[PDB]
Amino acid sequence: ATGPTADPEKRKLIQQQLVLLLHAHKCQRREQANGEVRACSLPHCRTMKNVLNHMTHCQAPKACQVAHCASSRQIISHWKNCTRHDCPVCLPLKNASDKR
Ligand SMILES: [Zn+2]
Ligand SMILES: [Zn+2]
Ligand SMILES: [Zn+2]
């Protein structure tokens, strides 16, 4: 559920979806900044980049009930609404972005 779900697979999958969505945005700009040679090899990154491009073409986002897209928009909507200084996935990402 979108609620305080405690199921461990939900924990890892939801946090990985959000982290790879942000990686897909990052890595799309990074790739576009070169436009002639690749800069990534993470197996799931290309799938999430495709899901992100779909969310850009999409018109329902959340009601676009397809597992990957509906999930993608629910996690990124959480990240958009977030108060991030003390959240279970927010705090990790904040440490994962301490420098650039
Ligand atoms: Zn990547
Ligand atoms: Zn969609
Ligand atoms: Zn959060």
From Swiss-Prot:
Subcellular location field: Cytoplasm; Nucleus
Binding residues annotated for Zn(2+) 1, in chain numbering: H23, C27, C40, C45
Residues binding Zn(2+) 3, per UniProt: H78, C82, C87, C90
Zinc finger (TAZ-type): 7-93
Sites where the protein binds Zn(2+) 2: H54, C58, C64, C69
Post-translational events: Methylation of the KIX domain by CARM1 blocks association with CREB. This results in the blockade of CREB signaling, and in activation of apoptotic response. Sumoylation negatively regulates transcriptional activity via the recruitment of DAAX.
Role of this protein: Acetylates histones, giving a specific tag for transcriptional activation. Mediates acetylation of histone H3 at 'Lys-18' and 'Lys-27' (H3K18ac and H3K27ac, respectively). Also acetylates non-histone proteins, like DDX21, FBL, IRF2, MAFG, NCOA3, POLR1E/PAF53 and FOXO1. Binds specifically to phosphorylated CREB and enhances its transcriptional activity toward cAMP-responsive genes. Acts as a coactivator of ALX1. Acts as a circadian transcriptional coactivator which enhances the activity of the circadian transcriptional activators: NPAS2-BMAL1 and CLOCK-BMAL1 heterodimers.
Subunit structure: Part of a complex composed of MSX3, CREBBP/CBP AND EP300/p300; the interaction with MSX3 decreases histone acetylation activity. Interacts with DHX9 (via N-terminus); this interaction mediates association with RNA polymerase II holoenzyme and stimulates CREB-dependent transcriptional activation. Interacts (via transactivation domain and C-terminus) with PCNA; the interaction occurs on chromatin in UV-irradiated damaged cells. Found in a complex containing NCOA2; NCOA3; IKKA; IKKB and IKBKG. Probably part of a complex with HIF1A and EP300. The TAZ-type 1 domain interacts with HIF1A.
The protein's name: Histone lysine acetyltransferase CREBBP
Species classification: Eukaryota, Metazoa, Chordata, Craniata, Vertebrata
Gene name as annotated: Crebbp
